[PDB]
């Protein structure tokens, strides 16, 4: 198993939507998957190495839910805004930033 740690981020999205996403991480601090409960079911989206590059990271298969964001690693992951697209190509969580909890 290359996943050795997992970390969770809470987001606030447009249209008052909220989503919590758990990311798996390997020993190098890269990510291995994104997971979120979507319509009361957990959806597991492995990192898509066909689509991901130096600028953009994508999780999920073609035909499924896809999380898209910027560069993701153990340094960056809690600062990156995300979006989640449904299998039918509708954006179901839009313009999601990680929540400020600072006093
Ligand atoms: Na993030």
Strands 31-38 and 18-25: antiparallel
| CA 71–ligand 1 middle distance (angstroms) | 10
CA atoms within 13 A on the CB side of 88: 2
Closest-CA residue to 23 (of 50, 42, 47, 39): 47
Strands 41-46 and 82-85: unpaired
| CA 79–ligand 1 middle distance (angstroms) | 5
Phi and psi at 93, nearest 5°, equal -135, 120
Specify the 3-state DSSP secondary structure of 34: strand
């Amino acid at each position: 198993n290359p996943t050795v740690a997992k970390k969770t981020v809470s987001y606030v999205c447009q249209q008052g939507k909220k989503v919590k996403v758990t990311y798996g991480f390997n020993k190098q601090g890269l990510t291995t998957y994104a997971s979120a409960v979507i319509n009361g079911k957990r959806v597991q989206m492995p990192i898509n190495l066909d689509k991901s590059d130096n600028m953009d990271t994508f999780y999920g298969k073609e035909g499924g839910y896809v999380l898209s964001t910027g560069a993701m690693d153990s340094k960056s992951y809690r600062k990156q805004p995300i979006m989640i697209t449904a299998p039918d190509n509708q954006i179901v969580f839009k313009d999601c930033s990680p929540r400020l909890e600072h006093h």
